[model samples]
Target: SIYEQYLQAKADNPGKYARDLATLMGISEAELTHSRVSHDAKRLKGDARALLAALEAVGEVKAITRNTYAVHEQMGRYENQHLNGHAGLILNPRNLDLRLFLNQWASAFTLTEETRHGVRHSIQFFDHQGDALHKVYVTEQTDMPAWEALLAQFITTENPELQLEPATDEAVDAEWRAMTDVHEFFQLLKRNNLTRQQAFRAVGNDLAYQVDNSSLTQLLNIAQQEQNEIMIFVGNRGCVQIFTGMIEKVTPHQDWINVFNQRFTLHLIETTIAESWITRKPTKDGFVTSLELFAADGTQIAQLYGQRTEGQPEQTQWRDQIARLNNK
Candidate 1:
């Protein structure tokens, strides 16, 4: 079996290696951690609200979020965290930033292990399907005393095993066509019966249509020419981070597309993108356009929108830019 072979290989190499433990074992990273290489991982109590309050103590840590294809990492303090019942927002725009949907956060863990980077301590959270939603890693500047205290205070169970629910199917309804108006779109989401991806799948070509991934490169280059202001939304099941303003430099290195701006940095793995779509939705202000990326498994990778304020008309330059690219 693969697990038996993994054990032998791990034993042969007692210490860390250049490659990640998951790849070395021929398993997904989630499987590797879920299968028990993750030591000193304690189940945490409380919902995301309580966890956010607790994490405020461990100031200056790294926040990491990802889906099947894209990963987002940011370094900042857990400041200005606010939460209501089902919705939440972190307002530290220039640094640690996030928009949260609380329902997906099902489990939390405090994980630690001896690695090439020394004693690594982090808090990891997962969704109902046991997919990692978000993680916070202690940085050199983190307050160790606070971290330890938080860990001990929040430990809920010692059970090393996690039982995750089976994945639920997303329903694509024909009612998505009724979303001809912008306000109707918000109402559709408020109904909460369908997912955003499902909405895209159900909408017509005029509203949402699949495009080549190369269209992303064209959009980025065009935005650079006009120096257009746009919004980039990158997230996992737990946290969504938005970057507003101009993306000055886009560097393609290997499989990654990096956005180097003064205030924000985005690193995206272009190779993981299996599908891309150009979507247009009506709004009270005007029509809004977006470039959406997805993995082969239907997992959304990232979303880019033209920056516009509510009640204000949509940015003409930004809209025209996506229109031309989509036409191509």
Candidate 2:
């Protein structure tokens, strides 16, 4: 019955992405994908290490990572991939850079569909809760031979039945006293009990406090005006993609805010932002200030921090810019 309803809702909205359509139908995006008729998709093993290594073969593909409020898509090959313990890193920042927490990756799938644009192919990865963690899609420059080989290597039978764990609730109303120095802040994070959203709320007013959602636009404008080199951190449960540079183009369209730059592009839905905070974290180099954005569901959409190279302190101008936004 629910599957029939979902199909009808999807048919009604021939334009919306599955994630957006699922939200309107009051279901998780993963449920929307999982409910597809037997012909829609095929499940693959949730093997990040193997899948990532295989990806290198499919030269020049698009790597996409997103959250509730923002989407980050980078067009490039998966190059210089390295696995360190439980994590993975893409050292090549020029083409689809990433810092991946391999353990959070749980499920995988390959979807082949004929849309108005044409036939589409994608391999998607999700967390244990069925929330999308990362996705890879074929691009014009993709090597068809390699892509086909990858699909053959990991393809599995489609199963309509799914047994997923409940999504975990993020820490709320976390209690952390005011920290006069940055050393204690890093230690707090290392304890592995608090979420990023909770850390902002728990920290004292001197280090963290909420600001108006409009501050996002203001910060972007200031970053562009001042030519500030900042690092934009956007990720889901599995990967964190960083763009360390200046954003020259900032456009606001309807409810979405977009950054169109040479190497990095971001599309963030402003209406979904429930809170914004200016956070100051003390690092070994200096105080690292960040503008953190969160959705109504307590999920962090993205974070903006001053770009800092190895052994270098964060730029003071970035902190000054954030201070202006905080005061506004």
Candidate 3:
């Protein structure tokens, strides 16, 4: 089993926390703890940086820090942090048991190695993912009919992986873990640009980037190039083969647009594992949830693509906002 290697890594040396981690990152444990809890989670970067350095020190594996504590390690290094013990054996039906297990194990895999050796990985998920999601809206901006069609086509599709609660008892743990992963990283990396547009539009059409014809054309071009797909799941309206993930974002920003005039934003599902790669290397397997959308004027409108929503995107009064906007 692929997990066997992970077991071996754990056996080779157990993961160490705090003091040792501090030694690697060159920060005190107290500071490390503070970083972990701080609103911005800036201090955790020290550990991530240290972990990257340590991983590099061994030269046997590669790893990079993402967000506060997320460290993307190379396939070869998958074993480093994985314990694969009682937790490893646990499985969920919704998640291909092995795949889900691997993702969780990855959280710790090779972390100590990176910490001890000090390997620095250039984190890429934060860089272009927003641009990637924005591209989605921009390419389709010019073709209103196509955009509408695409919107309707994808929105109707069901995604079972996205649920208010895990679909099954077996899936709960893994799904929860996945949920935690998504929520923590979203504000920093997820694309909320589309909501931004709606917010601006409510204030004045001149500020709405989606109003530009060229923006939609670019979005359509991107959709064609990527062969994009979209999915939406409502409890009463379930979908099939929808293990695809859940919906975290929605149309219109009625409340905010009505008041503060904030941008419309999407709280997307987890990015596909492919979208997670720091090197942009496509994985034959694994998931990195990513969501992106762009406007007609090359501005990102909204891109909340990622891990399926832990809870379904509730249908609220957003429809009325759109209806009112249409009349205008």
For each candidate in turn, the TM-score is: 0.77, 0.85, 0.17
Model 1: what TM-score? 0.77
Top TM-score prediction, candidate number: 2
Regions more than 4 Å wrong, model 2: 1-6, 24-27, 35-38, 158-160, 167-192
Give the clash total for candidate 1. 0
**Per-residue accuracy of model 1 over 1-328 as CA lDDT, tens digit each:** 4445555767677674312455677654444455443344566773678888888888898887776566667778777988875668887765787888788787776778666458888887777766677889898899999999988888764545555566122333444444556546646755756566777766567778888788777777788778888877888766797777787888888998888776467778888888888877765566778899887777778988887776788888887887776442
TM-score of 2: 0.85
lDDT for predicted candidate 3 compared with the true structure: 0.24
Give per-residue CA lDDT, model 2, range 255-310, as digits (tens): 99999987568999989888898877655666677788898888889988887765
Model 3 per-residue lDDT tens digits across residues 1-328: 2224333443555576333454455543333333332221121221222232233222222222222111111112222332233222112222211111112111111111233546322221111111000011111113345333433332222212111111232333222234333323223122332232333333322212222222222322333344333321111001001112222222223221110102112222122111110100112233232222332332332232222334443222221211222111
In model 3, where is the ten-residue run with the lowest total lDDT? 128-137
Model 2 weakest 10-residue run by lDDT: 167-176
